[model samples]
Each structure stands twice: as C-alpha cells, then as structure tokens.
Target: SLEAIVQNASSDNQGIQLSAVQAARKLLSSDRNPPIDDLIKSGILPILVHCLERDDNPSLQFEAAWALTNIASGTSEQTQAVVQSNAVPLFLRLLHSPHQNVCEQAVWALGNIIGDGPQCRDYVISLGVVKPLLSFISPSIPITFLRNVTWVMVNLCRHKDPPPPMETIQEILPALCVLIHHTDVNILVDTVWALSYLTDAGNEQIQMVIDSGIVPHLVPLLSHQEVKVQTAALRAVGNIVTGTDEQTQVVLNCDALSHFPALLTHPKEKINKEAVWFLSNITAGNQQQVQAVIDANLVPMIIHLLDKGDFGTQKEAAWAISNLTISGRKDQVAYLIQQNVIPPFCNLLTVKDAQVVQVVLDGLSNILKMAEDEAETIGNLIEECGGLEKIEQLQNHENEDIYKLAYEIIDQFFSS
Candidate 1:
C-alpha cells in the first residue's frame, strides 16, 4: 500500500527512504492512472516535501524534487497542494544546492510551479527566484539546465491579467537580451518567447527590451533556419514594434522591413498572420512607420491580404490600412491608392465584424477625403470594381458610424 510508501519516506534509514520515495515518484509519474490526486490527499505531499527539505541527502532531495515536479505538473489544484505545502521556498533553496543534479532538479520543479500560472508565478518570483535562476544562464551551463532555466524565465514573463510587475520585467531584461543571442535553438526559442511575453505586457515593458539592445539580434531571426525559432522571433519582434514610433524606429533601423512581406507570404498560417501583425503594428505607429511600409512596397501585400487572407489576417490587414490612411503622410496616402487598395478594400467590407467594416468605411472615406488628384481615379476604380455598390449597401448599415461614414464617402466622392 502507499501507506507503507508514505511511512518509509519518513524513515531515518536513508536507503529505505530513498527507495520508498523513488517508488512513490514513479507511481505518481504517469499520464495514465497516476495517483497524483489520491497521493496529494492521502498525506503523501507533505512527506515528499519534508524529504525535499533535507539538506544532507542530495540523492533523496533530487528524487523528492523529481516527485514534486511531477506533482506540480498536474492540474492547478495539485500545484497548489505543493504550493500550500510551502515547497516553493524549498525549491528555491535547492536551486542553489551544492549538488548539480539537485540544483537542476530544483530548477525543473520550480518551472512546473511557475507554469501553473499567475498566482504561483508571482509568488515564486516574489521569493527572489530570479537570482538563482540566472545563475544557470552561462554558456558553460548544461544545455538541459539552461533549457529549464529559460522555461522558468518564459513562464515568469507570461500572463497579463496581472503581470509579474514592471520591476520584474526590467530586472529580467538583460538576461533575456543575453539569452536571445545564444545560438542553441532550444535555449534561443524559450528566450524569444520570454521576450514576447514581457513585451506583450505593455509599451513600458516593450521599451525595456528595446532600450536593452536585443532588437538587432532579434530582428533577423524572422527568417531563422528553425521554424519554431522563426515563429518565436516573429512574436517577440511583433511585440517590440507594438510600442510607440520612436521604439518602432529601433526595429526599422535594423533594416527589418524586408522580412515583412516575405513573412506575410509564409506558408505556415500562424507565422503568416504574425508577420501581418508585425506590419500591422507599424502602421499603427507614425507617418515614418507608414511611409516606410509604403516605401518598402508592403501596401500591395496589405491589399492582397484583405482580398484573400483568412479572417484574422484580413482584420489585421484592415487595421494596417486603416491606421495608414488616418496617420500616413500625403504622399504615403497617395502610395496606398497607387498600389490599388480599392478592390480589396472594398472586398474587406463584407466581413461580419462591425469594428472591421468600421475601419474599412473610415479608410475609404479618407481615401476620398484626401483624394483630390486621385478622387476621379478612386471613384472610377470603386465604380468599375463594384466597390461603389459595396459602399451603397453600407449606407443603410445598422451601425450608426458605418452608415454615416459610408453615406458620407459615397456622396462626397461621387455626388459632384
């Protein structure tokens, strides 16, 4: 019975305690029929945690941490059982254990806890786990240990309902900057995700990574050899440009614009959408960002995406075009027209999402609003492409803004 396993786990005979705990860990270790829930409630958790706290027995500590790692990997309630058992501080302490095996095992154990999400993540960080976590970031550290450390770092940088805190992000910035330049795809991928989460937290967090100099190394990874690394880099760089104009210029200064259209054509659907977002956020920034995309010839791709890209891709492209028309300089706005945005711009108006069609209406209005030279040309293209009919249909659109803008654009551009 597990009761015997539990009893001997507390035994003074180190060998007996080790075997019993090892057996308990194995029994609790599988996807099928693992007695994690039963073990947690049957008084096995504190025993495992108690053995985990023993400093003299490094082997026992490793096995104890392994078992706890498996337990914490369970559902969040089970993770809380480990957390409520006060095993977090034990995990933190073992992270500095003299025995390398024990230290690495502690790192994995902590990763599982942090992965449970915001509550335990913030708690683990609040315990000063980042110091010991950084100790393993060296090039000389074991690859697997570095992997575990970076995974913990990624999870720490995750979750925004309540983020880990600006102080945490700022403090971890240099480490993320360091890890991003590492060549190991394994270590490289996690650090990229780690950067993405921190940047995704907000502009302040975005600026932290920007000012820290990870961008030069980060930008080119968009076309990295490994697809996962490419996907991860796309997201991190995506978050970076999501900041203000000055910060977006940091990415622009890296000559990263070439990858935008290339990735917009990426065969992988997810990467393609992310690449769209990359250019999308740039359009949201400023006139230089817009003119840069215009100069880079990203306008036609934006037009193409609105025509044939999937639902999400189309919405993102709409934002790029909308933001462009609203904030782009006069010549850049003219470039959007010259690139033939009308047909796809008209095609996009068919989506059921009001916010989407709202952007399309406002964008078309501006195209006409600023279309003095291009006005007749814009009017004829929409007329020839049936875009005028699209706007006419929207004149009765239930949304007040849609109706108002759609009617206004139609009459202002075509009435005279």
Candidate 2:
C-alpha cells in the first residue's frame, strides 16, 4: 500500500513524488502499529532520502526528512535500515540548508538516528555532525530549530561505555555552552542534557566547561520552572561535581549548593534522590567543598534520606555521608555527628549489597576515629542505635572483607 507511495516517491515527476513523500510520512506516523516494516521493506528509504537531497523543493525536502525521521524513530532494526540505506550523510548535509524548514527536519531526523543506538550515534558523529550543528545556534534561527538541533546535539554526545572522544566534546563544547543558556524551556532542557553527556564522558575536561561561564547558568536551572528541565539540569550539575577539586571549586563557587535544601524536599523521588547523589559528589570533593555542603544545611536533609527513603536514595545518601566522613575536617565531621546519622548509618548494615556495607563500615571508622581525640559520643551512640548487637553480629558476615572490616570497627570503637 504505502510501498506504492514509496514506488511513486521514487520518480522525478514533482506532483506524484511530493505526494508520495507526504503519504509515506502520514501513513508511517499512524497512531500505533505503523506498517513500518512494510514501508522499510518496500524501499521507502532511498526515495525519501533522495527527496531530502533535492534543492528544488524545500517542501519536498521537509516532507522527506519527516518520513525518514519517523522511520529512524521506530524499532532499532528500522533505524538500522535507514542507516543501511546510506541516508546519514544526506541528513548531515542538510544541516546547512538555506531552508529553515528543511534544515530543522533534517536535524530532527538526525536526532532520531543518533538516538537509536551508540553505534549509530558515534557513526553520525564520525561524519562530523557537530561542526555543522554549531551553526544552528544563532539567536535568529527559528525557535523550533533550537529544540531539534539540541536533541541531535545531545545524542551525538551520549553514552559512557566509552564516551565520545575528547576531540568530539571539545568541538561541540563552545556550541553547547551557548545553547545551554537559551530561552526555550524545552530546548534548554536537552541543551543541558548535551552538557551532561560531555561531563559524563570521562575525558571531557571539566575545567574547560567550567571556565566557559556556563556553570553559573547551569547551576540555577536546578531550580528551573519545570521539573523536566530540572531533571537533566540537576544531573548536569551533579556530573560537574564528579570532576576534580579545581573543577568542583567552580560549582562550589556558584549558587548551586543553596538549592539542595529545597530540592531535597521536593515530592519527586528522582529529584530528591538526585539531590542526595549530587551531594555525594560534593562531599566526595576536597575538604573545602565538603564544608560547602555542610554550610548549605544539607546535613539534615541527607539525614532524612538515609533515615527513611527507598534503598536507591538511602544508598546514595550513605555515599554522601560516607564521603563526607572520608574528607571532612573534625568540625565538619562533628557536624555530621551532631545530626545523629549513625543510627541510620548503622541501619544500612542490614542492606544486602556488600559494596554499600563496606562504605558504611568505612564511614563508621572515620566517625569513630575523628572522635578518638575527645568525643565518646559514638560508644553510647552505637549503643543507642542497636548496632551494639548488629556490629558484633557482623563479625560473622558471609563476606570475609566485610566481617574483617566490621570486626575492626566494633573492636576499635565499641569494645570496652
């Protein structure tokens, strides 16, 4: 049926061809089961991509790109078919189209292709999509282009199995730094998603991104008007904290820390969980940065997370608290102690994951060690927490390393 549209779309007769391009897209986009496989089998790809390659009809190019976009957006197998047809280069070429409608749809289609999988993502990037994508960031480009290009922009930089190469992020960095500050709430959400992907890519050189003056803007969106924007914005800011001391200093210098108190209380679990996760990265930073967390009054919020949240958030809060104990000075350590996190901190031992158990055990060591010079709050603290028994019981843990570490904490901190 639509294959006939594919057949007719293959010709140069403008009327018939345009209608085919239009028909293929309309039919392929139907409300659920899209006869998608039938169209791909009938060779809709070449016909549509050829239409995209044409300069004569901007409408033809737009319609064709839209069809190809839907095809690439379907099952991974369908996207693979679009890629197999060699349509990637034509779409990459259309990034420079003088026709706004044509160019925007091309960007949209490229995002779908890139979104299909890491192989196609790196493949499109291998063809140099970022260099051309940079041009689409102008203040004058249609508002819709911002959303399309930023989506394409993010998918190109996504993933961490092996993140985008250093050069890829560097080329796109300036462009992303600009796009990250735009007005379209929707576009800006993904724009921040783009920033986070680079930050996730280990070699993305966090200091360079921080120096670009985008961090200040990125930090505040943690409190953006919409949760959707805040979701990625929180992640991007958190990833920045995942970098080195100097890199984290930039975040510490921003108003970023001040938002966590509000963010932690938000009803959304994802935000609250991420809020603690972000704190873990900061607490995981240098001593001054650890104190920055304390100064933000995040201590109690995290205490609540550790005290009563899902395992996911509890584990994250444990990391944040554990990390603080690792680097925090005596005063900062005392501040955590003041919050009485040990009860919940000790309760973490009941969790099944040995990795998390080990973190809690080590955090206990730091807390007790810091108190050795003067504070016996831990001995009574341990007694009050029921871990006086829990601690001794761990002496018989299944994992040898856990029992060994657990035994030391009990002997060192709890033994009379």
Candidate 3:
C-alpha cells in the first residue's frame, strides 16, 4: 500500500498525486509509527518537499506539509532523514504561505523538527527561522495557527546553549507577552513557557521580560483554571522574583502576595514548590515587602510546612523562615517565636541535607541573636525542647559553617 501510494504520489496527474499525499499524511498521523525508511526509500520525502515548494497548488502544499509534519514527528533518525533531504528551507519558506493551512502545517513541521533536540534546533535556527517565526505572531492570526507559532517559539527558546541571545529574546518578548494573555490554554501554556525560559536565563533577561511589560500580564494567571497554566505562570513569576530589588518590587506591585495562600495550598506539588520559591525570594525584598509577607500571615504556614511537607517544601519553607529571621525587624522576630516555631525549627536540625541544615542553623543563629536579651528565657525554651543537644552534636558537622554556627550558639548562650 505504501508503494502504491508512493507510485501515485509521483504520478503526472495533480489530482492523483494530491489524493496519494493526503492519504499518506492521514496514515502517518496515527499513533503508530509509519514506515519512515520505506517512505524515504520510495523517494516519497523528496516528492513531499517538492510539493511544499510548488506554488501553483495550495492544497498540495498543505498536504505535503502535513505529511512532512508527521514524518518529522517521528524518531530522531526519521526527523534527521527529513533534515538530510533538505526539506528545512522549503518548510521555512512555506511559513510565509498565503494559505493559512499550509502556513500552520509548515510551522508545525518546523516545530517538530526543532523539538527533536538541541542539534536539530540549532540547525533550524542557523538556517534563519527566527525572524520568519516572529512574523507569524499577530493579533489577526488564527488561534490554531498562533498555537503553532508559539509552539515553534517555545522550541526555539528551549534547551539552548547558554539561553538564546539577549537580542533574540527581546525580539520575541513583545509577541510572547501578547500571547500570554490569549484565552486559549495551549497558547497560554506555550507562551508562558517561552517567558519561563527567558526569565530563568538570568537577571538581565528577566529585566527584559519585565521591561517588555510581561509581568503584569503574567501575574493574573496565578488563578488560571488549568493547573498546567497555573504551574507555568508560577514558574515565570518565581524566576522574575530572582532579579534585582526593583524587579522583585515590580512583581509585588502586581499584588503577587494575594495569590500566595492559594498557590501554596494548591494540590499540585510543583505549584506548591514554586509558590514557596516566590515567597522565599519575596522575603529577600526590602523591609516593607518582608513586612507585607509577614502581614499576609504566611509565616505560620511556612513554619507548619517546614514540619509537615516533603524535603523540597521543607527546604524552601526553611529558607523563607531564614530570610524572615535574618532580615525581619524585632517585632516580626518576636512574632515568629510567639507562633511556636522553635519546636519545629529544632525538629529540622536532624535533616540529612547540609543546605537544609545550614539554613536551619542560620535561622536559629538569627533567632538567638534577636532573643539575646532574653537569653535565659529563650535558651531555656530551646533546652526544654532538646534543641541545645542537637546544636551540640552539629558542632562536629562535616560542613564547616554548620560547625562554627553550632559553636557560636554554645558560646553565646550556654557557656555562662
């Protein structure tokens, strides 16, 4: 049957060839793997690529692109076969096709090729698909086509060497920011994914995202109906908070605080972790923002999370508590103690992770420093909870800082 389709695909009659290629496209689109090697051997790939380059028939170009899209979606070897057949230039050219179906399928095929991995992605980019890809994003573009465009952009931004260049990110940021607000969940997910990649690259790129007005659009998605949309939005905002004080302040100004309780309690672990990360970084902000977080009543939940959640959640909660203890004002520190954080705080001292233990030590150090004038009372509280014995054992910890902090805790409170 493949041989028969291939024969018909090469026929002189355009109608017969169209039927053959359409059938091939449908067959290949199934969940089962198509006969990629047989198709390649039958010279079907070159014929399909030829169909893409032919201007006279939009239908044939659409069918040809559809078949190639399926082919490119195959295993890496199969995708590389299409690449070796030199179909990429034709695919890039078809991205400009006036026929919407042809253009969408062309973008879809290119996205699949780019998704094959870094080598294929770089190859497509080197052939200059970026500008053409950007040209397809517009307010007037169909939602389906826009989805493919964003998918292609996501692939371009993903798994790159050292992130896409800053200029490249700036070039695409406006379009991505617009797509982030698209009502379509697929478009929103991919658009936010692109933003996540840019923001995660570093602070400079994060500033570009913020400067492009992406943060305002991104913040509202914290309550998006889809869990995946919420997850992606949370990740982008989390990365944004990792920037300079002004950038973190920008997210806070978006009223990111109001969403924290819901996000922190979301059923998804990833959403919870990202929420914690956002809070952790927000605590790294100036005093007012830190005070704002405390006012939001997040500290008690953070302390409870430290005692009840998994290691990752515990670590992030501990880090958040550490930030609050170190930078919080006197009243805030006193408030944390009044919440009974000491017992759970001491419970974490035996966790196996050194980083977790380090933060716990740092938090206790700050708590002790803040409570120095009340050393008799707070020290008795710690001793009553067996926290002092835990501190004494850590004096010989493998981590030098942990050891020093342990010794400092003893010298400061226990040594008379």
lDDT of 3 by residue, 336-374 (tens): 789888887888898899998889888888877887587
Q: Write the per-residue lDDT of candidate 1 for residues 288-378, one digit (tens) a residue.
A: 7787887787778778887788888888888888888768767877777777777888888877999999988888777777767877877
Q: What lDDT is obtained when candidate 2 is compared to the true structure?
A: 0.82
RMSD of 3: 2.8
Candidate lDDT scores, in order, read: 0.84, 0.82, 0.84
- Tens digits of per-residue lDDT for model 2, 209-275: 7767788888888888888888888888788888788777878788788888778898888778898
Ranking by TM-score: 1, 2, 3
Candidate 2 Cα misplacement greater than 4 A, ranges: 373-377
Off by over 4 Å in 3: 1-16, 35-43, 75-77, 126-128, 138-140, 395-405
Collision pairs in model 3: none
TM-score of 3: 0.88
| Overall local distance difference test of candidate 3 | 0.84
Q: After superposition, which runs of candidate 1 have C-alpha atoms over 4 Å from their true positions?
A: none
